[PDB]
Amino acid sequence: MWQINEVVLFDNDPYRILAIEDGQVVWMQISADKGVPQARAELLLMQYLDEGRLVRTDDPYVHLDLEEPSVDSVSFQKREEDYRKILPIINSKDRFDPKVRSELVEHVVQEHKVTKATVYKLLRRYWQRGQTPNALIPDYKNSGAPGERRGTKVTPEIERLFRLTIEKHLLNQKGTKTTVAYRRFVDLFAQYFPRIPQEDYPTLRQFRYFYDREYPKALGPGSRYEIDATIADIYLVDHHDRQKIIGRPTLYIVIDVFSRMITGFYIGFENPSYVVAMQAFVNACSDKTAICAQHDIEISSSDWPCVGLPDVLLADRGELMSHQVEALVSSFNVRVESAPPRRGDAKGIVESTFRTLQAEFKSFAPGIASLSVFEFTQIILRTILFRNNHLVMDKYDRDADFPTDLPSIPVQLWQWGMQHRTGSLRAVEQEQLRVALLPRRKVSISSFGVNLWGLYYSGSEILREGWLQRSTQHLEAAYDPVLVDTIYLFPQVGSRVFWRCNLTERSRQFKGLSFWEVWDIQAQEKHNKANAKQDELTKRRELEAFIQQTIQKANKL
Amino acid sequence: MWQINEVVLFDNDPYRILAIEDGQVVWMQISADKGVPQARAELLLMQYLDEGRLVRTDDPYVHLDLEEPSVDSVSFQKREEDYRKILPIINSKDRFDPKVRSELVEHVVQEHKVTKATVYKLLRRYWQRGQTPNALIPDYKNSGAPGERRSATGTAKIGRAREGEGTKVTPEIERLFRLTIEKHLLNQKGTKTTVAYRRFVDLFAQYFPRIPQEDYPTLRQFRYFYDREYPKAALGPGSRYEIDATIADIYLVDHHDRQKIIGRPTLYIVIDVFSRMITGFYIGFENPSYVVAMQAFVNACSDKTAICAQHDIEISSSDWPCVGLPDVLLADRGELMSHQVEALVSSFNVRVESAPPRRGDAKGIVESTFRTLQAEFKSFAPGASLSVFEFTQIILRTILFRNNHLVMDKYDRDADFPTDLPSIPVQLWQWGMQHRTGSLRAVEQEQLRVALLPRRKVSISSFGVNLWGLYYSGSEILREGWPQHLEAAYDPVLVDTIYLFPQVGSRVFWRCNLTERSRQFKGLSFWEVWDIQAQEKHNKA
Amino acid sequence: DIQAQEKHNKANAKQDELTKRRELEAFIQQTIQKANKLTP
Amino acid sequence: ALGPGSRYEIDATIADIYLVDHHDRQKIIGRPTLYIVIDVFSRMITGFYIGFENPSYVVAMQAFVNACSDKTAICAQHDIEISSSDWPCVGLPDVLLADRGELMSHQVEALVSSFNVRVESAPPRRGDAKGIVESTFRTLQAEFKSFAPGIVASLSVFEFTQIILRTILFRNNHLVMDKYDRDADFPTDLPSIPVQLWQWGMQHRTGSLRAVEQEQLRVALLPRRKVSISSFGVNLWGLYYSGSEILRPQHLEAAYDPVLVDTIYLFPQVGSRVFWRCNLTERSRQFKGLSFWEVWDIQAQEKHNKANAKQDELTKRRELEAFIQQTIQKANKLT
Amino acid sequence: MWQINEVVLFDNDPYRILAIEDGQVVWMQISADKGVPQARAELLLMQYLDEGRLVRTDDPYVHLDLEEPSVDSVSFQKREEDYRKILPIINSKDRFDPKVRSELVEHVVQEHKVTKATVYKLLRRYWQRGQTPNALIPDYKNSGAPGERRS
């Protein structure tokens, strides 16, 4: 038949069923603000349903199922107090009889100190809203009419003036300010209302508010780096030609201070110095996927996650060149200060399989076994990968703010610092950083091109700029001391642009060499120019030897 | 899914993406001349893309990075000076935060003595055009309105003042100019702009009779109009050469048949005057003369690799670098056949001036091992156990050693000579060729050799061509088989082949070889033939 | 009238129906078990 | 007087079988547990729920959500044609017997104030669910204890559910009780069968049940947790969610179902149960189709292999490096 | 490396090289009947040679080193006075400078009573056919159209 607390229409009037009992049905109207529940017989209701006067519907007070008032709020306390006050009446069996309802009402009034009208209102709300305690929540959410409009105040004539000024000035126009429109409105208001003094016009605050309302519109990873170096005793061999000898190698490495993780490396075949370690620093700031791929090693980004510039470099300015210091401090914003004492990390990398000599940093001095470098580089790369990824450090010091589930592995510390301490590193382009840190020397210019170290170079920019004529000047060029093929000329003193120059025909017979053996060959040629006078006598002796041999051989026949 | 410096359309407005970091994307509009970059979330961008309000397009500044202003131009220094101003701000990781940005702007203002609006404009230009230094090049290429006309407006005359005063070209004058050009100049040839100007003057006279003659448009204005919108588009290497000769007293023999005795050798050498270097040589077997020294001169101008290789000596181009003609040959013009001098002067452009007093530099080559007799040049007049091979080898090796390693003592070095430059012939030759001379001149060896050989008149008969009482014949003479004073060049060391000149006035030659009925003289030289004929004549009477 | 008689018959004893439907339940459970066993 | 719908009670049991998916017959789900709701007056079963974890009252509220809905759809979905008379159980009861201290606070608040259901003390249990199951299976005792979220064989589920439903219907409609304590007012021609007693009580004493709608009741009884907000969306239990209303406060909260990780219900303002639906993002897309227990197990496995696996991998990689280095050096020396 | 009086092809055009001094090379084209020799840098020619824009070819005027015109013929005389006319200009170190060249041309015009155009033609023909006296022999040998039918 029907359920409890369900609403029906009886001649376009909503009613709620309160109780169903054998032979009787009690209901109430939920449209007015007075009344009491009333009962009648089910047969009448069946008759009205058959005629079509009763129809089914929904509950206008269903939203009260979503309410959960917070503690120590007015709604919560008021609901609890109202329910406590009216509880004894609705629990009684004879709650729909006027007499017993009366005695209960005055019984509540006597002990709760409340008038009868409030008790009747509470009972009415409970019966008309759905027979739940959430039906006794006050309507304070209605106060203030949220979302609705409410030293002269604003008048409808003033509102019309505002709308007029906005309509002809602000709307469908660009480049117009609000202050000039306010000035125009002030002019209009003054020329309509001359009586009002000047200090009583509406302000620009009100004008702007109306216009806006009515017309909506500590130290983590990457903080500082360090540099170390070591020497390996083995002599290396050229890969393509197994007879050439290069020499014993020297290894430079770059270390993160926080996580003690290795970021870059370099291999050089001369005495260690701070000028050459800058190539290791350049390598440390790049992406090593290509270099690992070229050595038959497959790598992922996760394995070596170290690309970008650091914040501080730990090295002594005394042993570096001035242009390098200036480029680091000013051009790339990297601070340089004193280097702490170093420990044997590079020897720890290499001591596992080779004998090592102590390496000491000296000054830069330019001017006058069948293992190959490829296998050596592969071995060093794989050793670095293993040491970074899987080896656990025992002497590493742990600070207080570390989880107990964090092992002393450099990559885990790096990732923890990325996710908790320092974010990420800055971006840089590789070619500019690589060129800006090479050693440089003064060059000369003539009709044969650019002269550096006795070699001659040429390019397309010097030809187009017609320089060979109007520049015969103190110009600098950067050179890589490993290959003589290319140099980089700086066309203006203290500039940022460089031009690339290649070897000319006069010097192409030095192609493929490095500057060290070029200087060696030049020393040998100087010695030959010295001892040509002694060579002349040997040449003469060979001459008479051949002459006499030929004469005696002819005399034999 | 997004790349740095990528341009997208959002509600038909272009936006450029500047950075991506941990869920945030920073972007900036590139259409207006105000504003600052904004940041949003990537999920919102994905919603925008899926809905259909965001699309991809191309960057309108892709051409910018492929630019290169020249140095000393205002663009270069302005770019370099402006990029140095905003460097501390773009190097910061807090450059997208208003308060830190304000602090950085204040620092830049205090340091570089520049206003705040300029800094904001520079930052906006850097961000809107692609985050490259070329984004800081000014727009001075737009000033002056390049490629547009200035005739419609104004009243005054543009240009210099007449050294009295003309007029200004107006559109009606332009119409008259175009009418005249279309009438008298277009789609024709051989007509001049001066007569077209004369034709325009008459038309201007009849249209504007009031204006005097001195206020007409001039010919420069007419020509500029027509061109604008009717386009028609001291000593050194290889400068003087000298000749010297000597005689050695030893008697040489044939290499194969050691019984035969050839005689006493004569040696010719050619010397470079500047660096005192030996350039060529020739071995004779008679009294020295200039006609035979021409062969040494021929050998001096060729490549010597082949002749040295034939004698089992291996050299390179750097050991004997003398290929080409000198400017001057220094010998006696009187004691030469006229055709030789004519060929040298006209066809090859080599001057012949008189020789200076001689020296003894040939003896130093030859006197080191053998005794030498005096040699004297005189007029041409034709009509032991040691082979020539070993003698030639010895001469070549001595000359090579003298040229490469010996150091001169009496030589006077030039003022410009570097101190570390040894006084050696090849070093001086290379230095002078690198600094003063440049290069030598080109020549073909066969023509030069044939042009300097001796010549003799021949006769025609049934047997063939008769030279010095010998008979020659060839293929080309058979076609015609014919006497207008023909002539032939011969080599006085071998009688096998001769060079006939059929056409007078040109040195085009035919090759002729000995016939069967006179080749009992084959293999030997003209001197032996002359001796045999002389002794036969003496003993037959 | 027949429906009332059928209802009275069903409500008379209902033990036979109880046993028959228990047998049917056991049979269908065994059928499902056998089908599950033969499924793989 | 007591009647149908005056008191409801909960019971649970565990069956010693292992279940597999209906389509993929190679995935083991686990041992099943059964929850049932009993009406005290008629001893009739009103709702059910099948779980796969430790019995608890927090999870037992899903059988109460089931008990108040219409069961025709689920019976049809398991290929069973049913009429209303066989299962007449739709509406809300008066009192629910359970442990008030073992439930969450929001659950009790919603039950008491928003739906007006009184929560009282539970009586001792009997072998009801056990008696349902032990007919053709093996049973071990099940004990309710606390809710523990977070980190700490040829039969399919379809056939098990079909058997359970048919057994429930048989016991409800046809079986006759023996130890039932009859009342004086009962007619002599009324046998002790649950549906007959239900009909007599509804006709004589109680009337009907109360109205309710299922979506609000189900959402109000789910468990909740605090969430995080960032540029990656909403973070709950380590997973990431997003929705349309987010792309448009310090203490926000969300409701989740521990059975499927696909959707969550965020509550934007306090004092109301209006919610927004949030779905998984691609950043967590590889967790689709799983449950929360499996996700917690996977996280436990991931966090487990970080104590001895470190040294094991250290040693393995060390000898691997030694081997590759030695073979490379030997190959180089040979050439 | 190049020699004096050598012919090269630059973008499929023949050019003859006339002089070399201290990194500068003077060259003239030999195709048209107008123009003056131009100078540029040697490294630019190296650049051109690098990417195959400059190759070597054969001299189209080698046949002139075979001619010995007889005395008392018109070619002999004409060549003699044509050489004596321009001898002052070609013996100067400023022959490739426009202004000094103009002054020398004016001097020859005044002293020999000849037209400026003839002097420029003689200079062009001397520079184009290999810098020898034989380059100043007239083309009278083609006159008369020998070995043809007049019709």
Place this chain on the structure above:
DNA sequence: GGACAATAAAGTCTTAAACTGAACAAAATAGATCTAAACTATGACAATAAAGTCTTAAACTAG
């Protein structure tokens, strides 16, 4: 047919007067960039006032 003019056709050269094109310097004109001082839009805080809901006291009222 031989021979000797011998007349004419085809190509090359010089002149004389005129013309041309590139380069420089000075006018007039058009667009771009910076300064210096003032200005504008926006957000945060505090105060004030309007609009709605609530109970009390006392008499009233329909039955």
Place this chain on the structure above:
DNA sequence: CTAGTTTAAGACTTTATTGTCATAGTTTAGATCTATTTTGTTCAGTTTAAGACTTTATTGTCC
């Protein structure tokens, strides 16, 4: 009687409207810079028609 209703007054609850700051970023007139177009003057090198010279094929007069 009597069970249920009406009204005026004062306090409470919620929120819209307004007054002052503080500051990151923008506007504006005027001066100066950078580049252009248009015209006057000069000079090194070029064009063009007419006639003359150079060479040789084709024909005439004669044997």
